[PDB]
Amino acid sequence: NEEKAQREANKKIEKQLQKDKQVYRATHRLLLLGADNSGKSTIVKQMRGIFETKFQVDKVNFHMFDVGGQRDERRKWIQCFNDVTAIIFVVDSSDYNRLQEALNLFKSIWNNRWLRTISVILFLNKQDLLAEKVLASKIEDYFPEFARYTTPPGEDPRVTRAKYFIRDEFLRISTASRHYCYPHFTCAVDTENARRIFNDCRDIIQRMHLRQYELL
Amino acid sequence: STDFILLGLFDHPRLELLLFVLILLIYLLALLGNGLIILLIHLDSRLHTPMYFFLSQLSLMDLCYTSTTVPKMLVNLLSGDKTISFAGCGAQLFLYLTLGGTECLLLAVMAYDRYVAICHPLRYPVLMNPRVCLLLAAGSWLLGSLDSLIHTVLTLSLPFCGSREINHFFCEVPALLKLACADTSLNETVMFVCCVLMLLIPLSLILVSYGRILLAVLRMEGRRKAFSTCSSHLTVVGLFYGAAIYMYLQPKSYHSPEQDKVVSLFYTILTPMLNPLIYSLRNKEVKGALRRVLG
Amino acid sequence: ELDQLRQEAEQLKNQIRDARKACADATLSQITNNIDPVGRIQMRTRRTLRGHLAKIYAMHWGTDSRLLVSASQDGKLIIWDSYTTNKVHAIPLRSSWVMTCAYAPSGNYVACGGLDNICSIYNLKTREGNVRVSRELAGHTGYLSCCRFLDDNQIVTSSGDTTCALWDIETGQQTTTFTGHTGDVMSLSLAPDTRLFVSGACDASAKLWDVREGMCRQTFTGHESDINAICFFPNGNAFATGSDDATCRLFDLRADQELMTYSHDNIICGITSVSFSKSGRLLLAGYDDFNCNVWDALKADRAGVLAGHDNRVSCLGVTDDGMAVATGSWDSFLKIWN
Amino acid sequence: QVQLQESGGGLVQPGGSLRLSCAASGFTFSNYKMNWVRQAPGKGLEWVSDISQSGASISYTGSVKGRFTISRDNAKNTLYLQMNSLKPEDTAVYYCARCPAPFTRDCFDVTSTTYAYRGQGTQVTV
Amino acid sequence: ASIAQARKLVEQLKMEANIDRIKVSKAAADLMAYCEAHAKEDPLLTPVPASENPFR
Ligand SMILES: C=C(C)[C@H]1CC=C(C)C(=O)C1
């Protein structure tokens, strides 16, 4: 009776599902996170509810999401983002007042149970303002151990100590405990971000493929 | 009557029993091993990737190859008969050549897939859509069948002179060509062209792919696992190709057949056993799928 | 003065607690200890469904106990046919992020929603024959967490705005709004008579709302963390609550207090789905440890395990006939147990 | 129901000493990680220090390191905070927070404006 | 800011203070009576034979 029609309908729908599977597997997804003062809007609009943007690099398609229409509590809707390729994390380097909040957010994301495989690509924005602020508020006020730090920029060597001290905290939190971290120094006027994201995603996928064949 | 007589691997009857059971044991293991892996691919949906598609193809090819080559010798040794008909020899030769060529091409196909997967991580899905996999498999099978048919037809036409006694334990090409009445110069030329085309290129491709893979891994305890896995794979690949290269490409047939029999034995039966124990059974995914199927 | 109001709050809380303690003369478990246990409950999977690409958050059975609908995170809504494993409709969503789904009591309509803050209603009985979007309900601030049909003209939704609302499908405007929670509202459930409904929040609190009036009749507390699931007893005078502290609890409306707690020392993972049986004797609970458990609702003793999944279990449902169970997971696999 | 009471604040001259005590009821103490937060007038919530389940690992913020100490007592179900040599910029309202879920080493939404598991806090002036 | 929610909590508690509350034993017996009344129509409690099973 209706069994023949149901078989035909099932075949028709399965053909479309097989067609859409490849398109689903073709693109790479990314999640953008940051603070209000951070210039993540400029970052996401440089290559151009939930705001999506699409960009193509070397015939590879990326798709990154920015969620800003929700409230300030994120312990519940973050679990949906456990399948993304990478989490872009934008941090201001010129605001010493709110650096501890960024550190705590990074630690919470790092130690989350459903995000123990996702990698984080770290952008440290606002370097031009940091250089002017350091060259001319002192960072020793909010971090005592800066009095005992030694460097591991080109215009003046006093900026290098601070701009590496700020990164060393995130690196220490990352190495204190599968997934890695990729720090980067960037300004507001810079067009190299897409290439950096491309290289980081290429490295992540290469490591995953190496683990797949049990070469590691 | 146009039958043939096979002298077997050995002449002394005191070695008939032990070898027999040993060989018998061999056969069973291979069967089980191959069958097992096929099941673990058909049931679990986690392992639906081109790598495991190629692995399943290889396991099926090994099953067919072993079932073609092994049981006849055991039956002849058990029953004591040493005769074989013309059609049996022809069919054995045809299946032997087809499966050998198909495996030789499938190894290079797998090597190319590995190279693409590792050295182009982002373009991998675009380059390995299922259409490409099906076309590669179909091309390998078609080429194997073509060369096997050419060899069988061009070989069985010539008459045989003198006795119908073959110094081998199964129907081979080099043993048959030496009894031919007519000139074998064209036979030698065709066989040499087929040998070089079906052997030398895949070995070079596999070696280049492995070299590039290890170079990329070097540019990254990580190194030791990669070295161990690559050495384990290269052992089997080198054995399988070196035995055939020594056999079919030897000059002037200077070497006595007494060691040639065991040289052929090294690549006839052992490599189908070694294939699953190296490529498949040591994977963590295979172990997890087996435990899930049991549980 | 905020201090005087804060004080009055605690004297009223003390009065409520004193009344609850005085009202508790005995315990349900002591009375139910006289009945014989049900033994061991062993079910085997009878059907498995494949076709989704990403994980699964929600599902819903039909009133005819034959068809069901599932929503997946790759942007797909698939209607199945559990009898012959065939599948009838596949609808692509506007937004890839979907958290809930519903199936109309008459089977004509389907609904969906998620992070897009929009509720979408799809028509299944179009004259052309294809599925077409019919209405987009807008007005919420946070993400939608649950939606349930009252009839073919009304629908009640709960959002991450710490609010619930009742809509009018023909016009697409909120007739009534329910407020009073402090955190996110996670799930809701309609009474068998469709006259009242309960709602659980991330404030470790449940509330009982009246549909027509628009006021909160009573509230229940007793948990220690966020509440993920809730459902009525088939009688309509009790319900069960599952939270993230790895404990289930049973409340009753008339006594206005707690009856039983279902917990074990081996479990340290929260509950994501709670459902009852047709007779109300069995309570099925899904955990984060990749398994499910069947508790005796009158003895608090585990009577079986459902260990067929290798990832987190997100949705769990029981047919209206009480003859089959459907359990989804983050594997893109649906399983039917009998 | 989770209930938290803070006490011990009051007037203090600069360079003095102070004790803040928090009492918790309605939940098991030893399964949760505990936090102290503060809010200055005309400013947002600021994280101060925290202590783990058993007290093995404690963490501090930048501006109070070497001056404040935090401790817990599971038998009495209480939390403590010591203040020594108060700076004039330490006047604020203090709250005691709680980890949203047990058996976790991460904390989400602890300094949010509408958190549910936190106390009313006490006022400290210098 | 917090005055409105405090007032709403005050009226909510005031209105919830005066409710009818029956003894626990009444609901305890009612639930048992309902469970035993409909115990014969639960195919999951008593496994259904394959003769009428639609998922054979
Ligand atoms: C591994 C084999 C059986 C090959 C041996 C040599 C040639 C030329 C073949 O075609 C088959």
Q: What is the CATH number of the domain that holds B148?
A: 1.20.1070.10
Cα distances from B168 to residues B95, B176, B254, C248, in angstroms, run: 17, 10, 17, 76
Nearest to B65 by CA among B28, B26, B92: B92
The atom number, within ligand 1, closest to the CA of B194 reads 8
What is the Cα Rg of chain A in Å?
21
Q: Where are the beta strands (DSSP E) in C214-256?
A: 216-221, 227-232, 238-243, 248-252
Helix H or strand E encompassing C58: strand C56-61
Chain B (43-62) residues lying within 8 Å, Cβ to Cβ, of chain A: 51
Structure tokens at D111: 């300094």
> Per the CATH hierarchy, to which homologous superfamily does domain A2-213 belong?
P-loop containing nucleotide triphosphate hydrolases (3.40.50.300)
Count each helix (H run) and each strand (E run) in chain B, helices first.
Answer: 11, 3
For the record, the structure tokens of A11 come out as 């075949």
E15 C-beta neighbours (distance < 10 Å), count: 13
> Six-digit token pair at C317?
């449902």
Question: Could you tell me the end-to-end alpha-carbon distance of chain A, in angstroms, rounded to an integer?
Answer: 56
Contact E12, C180 (CB under 8 A): yes
Query: How many CB atoms are located within 10 Å of the residue D113 CB?
Result: 12
At the fourth CATH level, which superfamily is domain C2-337? Answer: YVTN repeat-like/Quinoprotein amine dehydrogenase (2.130.10.10)
State the distance from the centre of ligand 1 to the C-alpha of B213, rounded, in angstroms. Answer: 27
Please enumerate in sequence order all residues whose Cβ is within 8 A of that of B32, keeping only pairs 6 or more positions apart, or say none.
Answer: none
The DSSP-derived string for A34-101 is --SSS-HHHHHHH---EEEEEEEETTEEEEEEEE-SS-S--TTTTGGGSS-SEEEEEEESS-STTHHH
Cβ separation D101–C203 shorter than 8 A: no
| Best CA proximity match to C101, nearest among C48, C91, A51 | C91
CB C117 within 8 A of CB C137: no
**Which atom of ligand 1 is closest in space to residue B244's alpha carbon?**
5
| B201, B248, B250, B266: residue to mutate for ligand 1 pocket, most atoms within 8 A of CB | B248
CB within 8 Å of C168: residues ≥ 6 apart: C153, C154, C174, C175
Note the resolution in Å, 1 decimal. Answer: 3.2
CB–CB of A72 and D104 under 8 A?
no
State the DSSP code for B169.
S
Give C161's contacts in chain A (Cβ within 8 Å): 71
Contact yes or no for A6 and C202 at CB 8 A: no
Is residue B218 exposed (0-12), middle (13-18) or buried (19+ Cβ within 10 Å)?
exposed
Please answer yes or no on whether D101 and C225 come within 8 Å at the CB atom.
yes
Among candidate residues A39, A35, A207, A175, the one with its CA nearest the CA of residue A110: A175
Residue D96's domain comprises 3-124
Experimental method: cryo-EM
Question: What separation in angstroms does the CA of D32 have from each of B142, D20, D50, D100?
Answer: 67, 19, 11, 8
Residue whose Cα lies nearest atom 7 of ligand 1: it is B195
Question: CA A202, A204, A208 angle in degrees (round to 5)?
Answer: 115
A59: left (phi > 0), else alpha (psi -120 to 50), else beta?
Answer: left
Please indicate whether, in this complex, the C-beta atoms of A6 and C81 are within 8 angstroms of each other: yes
| CATH code where residue D67 lies | 2.60.40.10
Q: Do residues B137 and B57 make contact, with C-beta atoms less than 8 angstroms apart?
A: yes
Cα-Cα-Cα-Cα torsion B3, B8, B14, B17, nearest 10 degrees, comes to -90
Residue B221's contacts (CB-CB under 8 Å, 6 or more residues apart) are none
DSSP string over B204-269 = HHHHHHHHHHHHHHHT--HHHHHHHHHHHHHHHHHHHHHHHHHHHT-STT-S-HHHHHHHHHIIII
Q: Packing angle between helix B222-248 and helix B185-218, nearest 10 degrees? A: 170
Residues forming a β-bridge with D46: D38
Residue of A nearest to C312 (CA): A114
Could you give the angle at the alpha carbon of B182 between the alpha carbons of B179 and B187, nearest 5°? 80
Q: How far is the CA of B195 from the centre of ligand 1 (A)?
A: 7
Three-class SS state of E52: coil
Domain ranges of chain A: 2-213
Residue C199: what are its φ and ψ, rounded to 5°? Answer: -145, 135
**Alpha carbon of residue A10 to chain centroid:** 40
Residue of chain C minimizing CA distance to E12: C216
Our answer on whether B and D touch (3+ beta-carbon pairs < 8 Å) is no
Beta pairing partners, B295 = none
Q: Which two tokens stand for residue B257?
A: 């057949």
Closest chain B residue to the Cα of A216, Cα to Cα: B222
Contact A210, A216 (CB under 8 A): yes
Question: Strands across the sheet with D17-25, in order?
Answer: D3-7, D17-25, D78-84, D69-73
Q: What is the number of the ligand 1 atom nearest to the C-alpha of B151? A: 10
Q: Are B99 and B66 in contact (CB under 8 A)?
A: no
- Cα–Cα distances (Å) from C83 to C49, C69, C89, C128, E50, in that order, read 11, 14, 15, 26, 15
**Collapsing DSSP states into helix, strand and coil, what is residue A205?**
helix
The encoded tokens of residue C336 equal: 């039917």
Number of neighbours of residue E11 by Cβ within 10 angstroms: 9
Check CB contact of A150 with chain B, cutoff 8 Å.
no
Checking DSSP bridges between strand D69-73 and strand D78-84, what pairing results, if any? Answer: antiparallel
- How far is C110 from C62, CA to CA, in rounded Å? 11
Specify the amino acid at residue C294: V
Number of domains chain B contains: 1
Look at residues C152, C146, C134 and name the one whose alpha carbon lies nearest to residue C190: C146
Contacts of C324 (CB under 8 A, 6+ apart): C46, C65, C82, C318, C336, C337, C338, E55
Q: In 3-state terms, what secondary structure has residue C218?
A: strand
CA nearest neighbour of D121 among D57, D39, D58:
D39
Question: What residue ranges define each of the domains in chain E, with the CATH number in brackets?
Answer: 3-55 (4.10.260.10)
| Token pair 């002192």: residue | A138
Among protein residues, the one with the nearest Cα to ligand 1's atom 8 is: B195
Interface test with A, best of D108, D110, D112 (most A CBs within 10 A): D108
* Residue with CA closest to ligand 1 atom 6: B195
Q: How many CB atoms lie within 10 A of CB A201?
A: 21
Give residue B87's domain range. Answer: 4-294
Return the half-sphere exposure (C-beta side, CA atoms, 13 A cut-off) of residue D13: 1
Query: How many C-beta atoms lie closer than 10 Å to residue C237's C-beta?
Result: 16
Euclidean distance between CA atoms A198 and A55, whole angstroms: 11
Residue C50, Cβ density class (10 Å: 0-12 exposed, 13-18 middle, ≥19 buried): exposed
**Contact present, B39 and B116 (Cβ < 8 Å):** no
Nearest to C307 by CA among C332, C271, C337: C337
DSSP B33: H
The set of long-range contacts for B19-24, using a CB threshold of 8 Å and a minimum separation of 24, is B20/B74, B20/B77, B20/B78, B23/B70, B23/B73, B23/B74, B23/B269, B24/B74
DSSP secondary structure code for residue C36 in this structure: P
From chain A, the residues in CB contact with D61 under 8 A are 100
Instruction: Give the span between the Cα atoms of D87 and D40, in whole angstroms.
Output: 13
Please provide the DSSP assignment of A97-129 as one string: TTHHHHHHHHHHHHT-STTSS-EEEEEEE-HHH
In 10 A of CB A194, how many CB atoms?
A: 15
The contacts of residue E27 (CB under 8 Å, 6+ apart) are: C28, C237, C238, C252, C254, C255, C259
For A168, other C-beta atoms within 10 Å of its C-beta total: 13
For residues C198 and C232, what is the distance between their CA atoms, to the nearest angstrom?
A: 8
- Last residue before each gap in chain B (C to N over 2.5 A): 220
How many helices and strands (H and E) does chain E possess?
2, 0
Please work out whether the CB of residue B100 comes within 6 Å of at least one atom of ligand 1.
yes
Q: Please give the backbone phi and psi of residue C48, each rounded to the nearest 5 degrees, phi first.
A: -130, 145
DSSP bridge partners of C282: C296
Residue B6, burial from CB neighbour count under 10 angstroms (0-12, 13-18, 19+):
buried
Contact status, residue C116 vs residue C161, Cβ threshold 8 Å = no
Nearest to A82 by CA among A111, A117, A32: A117
Q: Is B165 helix (H, G, I), strand (E, B) or coil?
A: strand
DSSP A168: H
Rounded to the nearest angstrom, the distance between the alpha carbon of A213 and the centre of ligand 1 is 29
User: Could you count the other beta carbons within 10 Å of the beta carbon of residue C215?
Assistant: 10
Rounded distance between C-alpha atoms, residue A144 and residue D60, angstroms: 12
Torsion of CA C207, C325, E41, C261, to 10 degrees: -40
Q: Which residues of B touch C (CB under 8 A)?
A: 45, 292, 295
**Cβ neighbours, 10 Å, residue B236:** 17
B198 C-beta neighbours (distance < 10 Å), count:
19
Secondary structure (3-state) at B88: helix
> Is B244 touching ligand 1 by the criterion CB < 6 Å?
yes
> What burial class does residue E4 get, using C-beta atoms within 10 Å of its C-beta: 0-12 exposed, 13-18 middle, 19+ buried?
exposed
Q: Which residues of B touch A26 (CB under 8 A)?
A: 125-126
Cβ atoms of C88 and A9 closer than 8 Å: yes
| Cβ–Cβ below 8 Å for B124 and A59 | no
Query: CA of C272: how far to CAs of A103, C91, C292, C336, in Å?
Result: 31, 26, 10, 18
List Cβ<8 Å contacts ≥24 apart for B279-284: B279/B55, B279/B58, B279/B233, B280/B37, B280/B55, B280/B59, B281/B33, B281/B37, B282/A214, B283/A214, B284/A214
C-alpha–C-alpha distance, residues A3 and C79, integer Å = 16
